[PDB]
Design a protein around this ligand. Structure first.
Ligand code: ATP
Ligand code: ATP
Ligand code: ATP
Ligand code: MG
Ligand code: MG
Ligand code: MG
Ligand code: ZN
Ligand code: ZN
Lengths: 607, 205, 373
DNA sequence: GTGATATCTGCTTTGGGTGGGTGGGTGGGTTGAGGCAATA
DNA sequence: AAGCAGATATCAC
């Protein structure tokens, strides 16, 4: 072999490295102790440490990884068995903290050398079995033999040892020994790409415990050996092309993006009198002065109680003029939730809402037990509207296509954003006629909010100052906001984990009286409420109880739910002509005054 | 294009590059290649089946890509530079000034080094024959990295090649919905998202 | 001939288990089930793994660790256990299924270390393929000496005898397949997918190929969520392999004689012996028979109740207040009329249609949902 | 003198349209123009 | 040109 590698000297040097190196008790001695405690036989070693201690050992590791790494394994095994008298022997995984190469600059001089590259995973293959030891059985005497694989070639026996028959040994594929392999496609990082060039892609091969350690979408630093392999002209001939193909044999992956103390902090927050407003403020610091919308979105994030007999999910629609902060709110909620999806109602959209050989479930099914953010709600076609109505009413999605008949669970909360059909919101027009959506679909939303653009000058000045301040915000404030967001996420996770509020007797009486009063308002003069709204109240009440980290729904929760529902209706249920109390616009899609006027017109034309 | 004979289609040649002549040429550059014109050797049974005809290639040997100044910068330089945009066009003084801003493009970073969008978007709406296409054609020739496209000349790519550049969209109201969605997302996120049967990918735009 | 000690011991112990294992009632549990295997359409016996674990833990462990190796011997033991009854032809083949495996694995846990072991998985069926006959043991005639060779095993590829049985004969290339004395099994290929519950967050679904055999064919439908019990195996690239009777048809391992200068790759498929749903000619007498005694007396009491119309109405729709007439109508729809056919071949409808016109939020959707559930 | 075992000989391959659309597209090949059903 | 199937003469023991 053309290598200046003496195995014994390398092993001794590496054992010396483990014994004496100190991180600026040897660090890797502590690592071996932790290995014994945990039981995972993998030792990661930073190549920078090896370089610092020994520049020859580092140089040999980089130049001849295939020869040198096994000697490192031998050294670590010997040392570890001395210090602590395990399913497998420990395996060293040298790695570089930072990439040493760009995917675009890989060269022939790097073949069979240890390199580190950064990238984003796009595809991973299913597991590929590799034969390590073949199993043969004589087709006459049943005598069995085992042959070790040698550089991808197997020495098939020619004569049975026991009975001496020739050409009688058949390979039993499923009695052999196999190991795992996986193909991964790594895409060049957007930052390192030259301007205007398409991303480059590289092939990686992972084996044994490194399979399935990355998923598509991951951003990773990969340390491995650069390989060059010949390509056959066709499968039948032994001719090869003079230009070789390349891949990387993965050696190390680095993914580059409750505690009792944490629970104590969360409970301490939950004890504070104004936890509701604190969480609401933390929800979206950038948006300005949309307090009730933020409170509703917080309650949607917490959700109501899963009774398991009843949708427990809270649906919110934000309709308003263009140039407001609707998309920003949807983005902030999408970032916050763990199982959320951000999508658009337009059909041309990259990510679809509908389920469509591989069965592909849409965003609504993917957001099951989560929140689906739908940005261009008004731009949905009729089929998408039917799908959304089915999801919101039944919490399931039925498919009968290509011989597949099934029902998919979709228990998802919809946060939707809507714009008017005109260039601006029309005060003369109601909500239904401002946004061209069926009233049947609108009646499935618990809360509808209106984000109108004021004509006030003082509002313009205040918003301008807000935006300028944000344009000049400092890094410490941004970090503080990030910490508050993390606290909010942990609080919501804990509440979902351990809190299941239930209705107390006083809450029940409060809800019944609330519904009766809402009905009375209309009954005094029309109808001012319908039973579905009562259900909404219950959900909201439960959500509020969950914010306090309380297992009992109290009267305060009911009062808050009533206030929020009454504010949303006052925002979105107002008839531009006369007043608000009329909810017939939601139930029938036509204003009561409009209905009377149309009746008059029809009667007159009938005259 | 200017060298193709009348009523013909441009031809192409294959260039094989080795060693230190690599990484010199990129798509889109104008190059002068010195090399050797050779036939492609077949192999195996394909030698026998194919006759006396051969494909060709060029074996690359050399690839070649193809205080007065302060005084010009010192005085009334904004007016002078704007007036120099398409001088053969008359009367669009303020539009020409706006197009110069689109070329410099505004500051890309916040005061703290955070990345912010500097690119400036302009739309020229007007009645026919007011030199809209002439102005767009001029900006394409001046811009170092740019792509000119028509509403129906291409659909379903030019944006990627125009990254860090200028994308001149002529006949902007003739495009389809799919093309409109792509333009909308570029003016929002400065990227293009594609989905190959569920395999997502994001490109810089 | 060399003898596989482990497999023979497993066969003997499995025969003992089939003969001796006792149910709660004191009868032999599987004798009465094997008694059903006299029918031509029945060839599979379903055995609970918990019963086997109770009977003999070492046997259960050996079966779990060497399932692929020992399964033919378990089938032979079943054949012996059925041999007594006269109605079975000597040519019939019998197969064993294993029902209740306590532990479950995920589709992404199917690694090389699981090859040949007994496993249980869950998945959603995406596609089903047509049923085929698959050769398991071929009978061949030797053209040189006219000797009949039987029980030639097949390994993923159409295989002919290696050497003629006759000691005097030296033939290695010329044989004739006789279909009528060969043994075939029903074969079906299905493609399944990860369930939405199992699919990791932000991950493309992983698909798997499952092979059903004998009775298991046509028992899973696309869109169903099913539990499969069986084993994970490797299937070689058949297209690369050349045999005396079968030429090769247009990296991996090298060096096999059947390979020439070619490479052999492998792919993982699941060989399922049992299929079940993940979440589980009629006449009045048969309906009664399907029921237990308690259920039958409950049905009779219901039939005798003099307030049955009202009790049924209230039981079906408990969440709805009022609207008794609507409940009565929906109940009558559920019971239905008598469909009839005329002498000339035309049909008289017997089904009942009902319509509910309602104001908003009046619980008509509640009626539809109650009926649907 | 029989059992390997080394040498020699003849077949057909390739994907391709002079090898067919009276083989078949579940055996496998971009680009455009042309009928459908559902669509708006 | 490249490679497998078949035929056949040839060394060795
Ligand atoms: N209330 C507000 N608080 C903070 N920023 C606001 C507010 N209203 C408008 N803005 C500013 O307006 C821009 C928000 O535009 P955004 O994309 O969120 O709008 P949108 O409501 O989704 O509307 P559309 O899609 O119709 O343009 C940002 O500059 C944001 O700073
Ligand atoms: N102000 C002008 N100065 C010089 N040439 C002009 C002027 N206005 C129009 N032209 C000439 O008129 C012809 C038409 O101009 P051009 O094609 O750019 O118009 P346009 O606005 O793009 O039209 P359309 O809307 O029909 O596509 C060109 O030759 C252009 O040179
Ligand atoms: N008579 C009733 N008894 C009990 N609950 C009722 C009654 N009427 C309405 N409800 C309540 O109203 C809700 C049922 O609304 P549902 O969706 O079924 O209405 P709908 O008739 O389909 O109307 P729409 O389609 O306009 O929404 C549930 O809360 C149900 O409890
Ligand atoms: Mg928006
Ligand atoms: Mg023009
Ligand atoms: Mg309804
Ligand atoms: Zn043998
Ligand atoms: Zn014979």
């Amino acid at each position: 072999w053309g290598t200046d590698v003496n195995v014994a000297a390398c092993k001794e040097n590496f054992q010396r490295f483990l014994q004496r190196f100190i991180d600026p008790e040897p660090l890797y001695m502590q690592r071996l102790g932790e290995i014994n405690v945990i039981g995972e036989p993998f030792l990661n070693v930073n190549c920078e440490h090896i370089k610092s201690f020994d520049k020859n050992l580092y140089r040999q590791l980089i130049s001849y990884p295939q020869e040198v790494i096994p000697t490192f394994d031998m050294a670590v095994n010997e040392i570890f068995f001395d210090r602590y008298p395990l399913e497998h022997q420990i395996q060293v995984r040298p790695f570089n903290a930072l990439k040493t190469k760009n995917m675009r600059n890989l060269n022939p001089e790097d073949i069979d050398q240890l390199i580190t590259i950064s990238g984003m995973v796009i595809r991973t293959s299913q597991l590929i079995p590799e034969m390590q030891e073949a199993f043969f059985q004589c087709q006459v005497c049943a005598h069995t033999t085992r042959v070790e694989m040698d550089r991808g070639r197997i020495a098939e026996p020619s004569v049975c040892g026991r009975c001496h028959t020739t050409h009688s040994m058949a390979l039993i594929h499923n009695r052999s020994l196999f190991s795992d392999k996986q193909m991964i496609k790594l895409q060049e990082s957007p930052e390192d790409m030259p301007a205007g060039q398409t991303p480059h892609t590289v092939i990686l091969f992972a084996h044994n415990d490194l399979v399935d350690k990355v998923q598509p979408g991951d951003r990773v630093n990969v340390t491995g050996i650069y390989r060059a392999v010949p390509i056959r002209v066709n499968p039948r001939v032994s001719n090869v092309k003079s230009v070789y193909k390349t891949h990387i044999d993965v050696i190390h992956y680095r993914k580059t993006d409750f505690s009792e103390k944490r629970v104590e902090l969360l409970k301490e927050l939950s004890r504070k009198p104004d936890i509701y407003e604190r969480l609401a403020s933390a929800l979206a610091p950038s948006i300005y002065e949309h307090e009730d919308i933020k409170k509703g979105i917080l309650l949607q994030l917490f959700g109501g109680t899963r009774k398991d007999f009843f949708r427990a999910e809270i649906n919110i629609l934000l309709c308003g003029d263009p140039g407001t902060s609707k998309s920003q709110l949807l983005q902030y909620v999408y970032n916050l939730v763990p199982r959320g999806q951000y999508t658009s109602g337009k059909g041309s959209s990259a990510v679809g809402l509908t389920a469509y050989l591989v069965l592909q479930t849409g965003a609504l099914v993917l957001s099951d037990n989560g929140i689906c953010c739908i940005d261009e709600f008004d731009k949905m076609n009729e089929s998408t509207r039917s799908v959304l109505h089915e999801v919101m009413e039944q919490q399931t999605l039925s498919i009968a296509k290509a011989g597949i008949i099934c029902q998919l669970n979709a228990r998802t909360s919809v946060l939707a954003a809507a714009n008017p059909i005109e260039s601006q919101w029309n005060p003369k027009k109601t909500t239904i006629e401002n946004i061209q959506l069926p009233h049947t679909l609108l009646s499935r939303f618990d809360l509808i909010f209106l984000l109108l653009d004021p004509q006030d000058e003082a509002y313009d000045r205040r918003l301008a100052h807000h935006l300028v301040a944000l344009y000049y915000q400092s890094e410490e404030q941004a970090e503080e906001e990030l910490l508050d967001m993390a606290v909010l996420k942990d609080y919501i996770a804990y509440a979902h984990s351990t809190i299941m509020p239930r209705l107390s007797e006083e809450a029940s009486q409060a809800l019944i009286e609330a519904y009766v009063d809402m009905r009375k308002i209309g009954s005094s003069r029309m109808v001012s409420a319908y039973p579905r709204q009562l259900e909404s109240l219950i959900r909201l009440a439960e959500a509020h109880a969950k914010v306090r980290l309380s297992n009992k729904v109290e009267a305060i929760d009911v009062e808050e739910a009533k206030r929020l529902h009454r504010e949303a209706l006052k925002q979105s249920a107002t008839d531009p002509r006369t007043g608000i109390v009329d909810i017939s616009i939601l139930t029938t899609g036509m204003s009561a005054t409009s209905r009377k006027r149309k009746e008059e017109l029809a009667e007159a034309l009938k005259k | 294009s200017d060298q193709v004979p009348v009523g013909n289609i441009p031809r192409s040649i294959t260039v094989l590059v080795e060693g230190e002549n690599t990484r010199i040429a990129q798509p889109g550059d104008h190059v002068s290649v010195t090399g050797i014109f050779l036939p492609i050797l077949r192999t195996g049974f394909r030698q026998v089946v194919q006759g006396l005809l051969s494909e060709t290639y060029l074996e690359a040997h050399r690839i070649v890509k193809m205080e007065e100044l302060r005084q010009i910068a010192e005085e009334d330089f904004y007016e002078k530079l704007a007036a120099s945009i398409a001088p053969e066009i008359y009367g669009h003084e303020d539009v020409k000034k706006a197009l110069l801003l689109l070329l410099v493009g505004g500051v890309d970073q916040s005061p703290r080094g955070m990345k912010i969008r500097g690119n400036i978007n302009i739309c020229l709406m007007g009645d026919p024959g007011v030199a809209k296409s002439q102005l767009l054609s001029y900006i394409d020739r001046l811009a170092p990295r740019s792509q000119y496209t028509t509403g129906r000349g291409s659909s379903g790519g030019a944006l990627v090649l125009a990254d860090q550049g200028v994308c001149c969209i002529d006949e902007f109201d003739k495009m389809a919905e799919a093309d409109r969605t792509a333009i909308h997302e570029v003016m929002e996120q400065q990227t293009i998202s594609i989905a190959k049967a569920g395999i997502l990918t994001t490109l810089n735009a | 001939e060399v003898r596989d000690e482990v497999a023979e011991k497993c066969q003997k112990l499995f025969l003992d288990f089939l003969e001796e294992f006792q149910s709660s009632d004191g009868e032999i549990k599987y004798l009465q089930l094997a008694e059903e295997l006299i029918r031509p359409e029945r060839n599979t016996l379903v055995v609970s793994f918990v019963d086997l674990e109770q009977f003999n833990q070492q046997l259960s462990t050996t079966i779990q660790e060497e399932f692929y190796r020992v399964y033919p011997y378990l089938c032979r033991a079943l054949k012996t256990f059925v041999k007594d009854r006269k109605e079975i032809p000597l040519a019939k083949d019998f197969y064993v299924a294993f029902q209740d495996l306590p532990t479950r694995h995920k589709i992404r846990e199917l690694t090389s270390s699981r090859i040949g072991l007994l496993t249980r998985i869950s998945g959603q069926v995406v596609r089903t393929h047509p049923v085929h006959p698959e050769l398991v043991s071929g009978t061949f005639l030797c053209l040189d000496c006219q000797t009949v060779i039987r029980d030639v095993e097949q390994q993923f590829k159409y295989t002919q005898p290696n050497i003629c049985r006759n000691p005097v004969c030296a033939n290695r290339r010329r044989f004739l397949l006789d279909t009528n004395k060969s043994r075939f099994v029903d074969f079906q290929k299905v493609r399944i997918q990860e369930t939405q519950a199992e699919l990791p967050r932000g991950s493309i679904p992983r698909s798997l190929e499952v092979i059903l055999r004998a009775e298991a064919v046509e028992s899973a439908q696309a869109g169903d969520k099913c539990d499969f019990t069986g084993t994970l195996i490797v299937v070689p690239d058949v297209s690369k392999l050349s045999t005396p009777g079968a030429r090769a048809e247009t990296e991996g391992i090298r060096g096999l004689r059947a390979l020439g200068v070619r490479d052999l790759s492998y792919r993982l498929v699941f060989l399922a012996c049992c299929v079940a749903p993940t979440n589980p000619e009629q006449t009045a007498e048969s309906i009664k028979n399907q029921m237990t005694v308690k259920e039958w007396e409950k049905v009779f009491e219901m039939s005798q109740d003099k307030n049955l119309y009202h009790n049924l109405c209230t039981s079906l729709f408990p969440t709805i207040h009022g609207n008794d007439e609507v409940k009565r109508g929906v109940l009558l729809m559920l019971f239905g009329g008598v469909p009839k056919t005329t002498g000339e071949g035309t049909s008289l409808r017997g089904d009942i249609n009902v319509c509910i016109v309602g104001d908003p939020s009046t619980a008509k959707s509640q009626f539809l949902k109650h009926v649907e559930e």
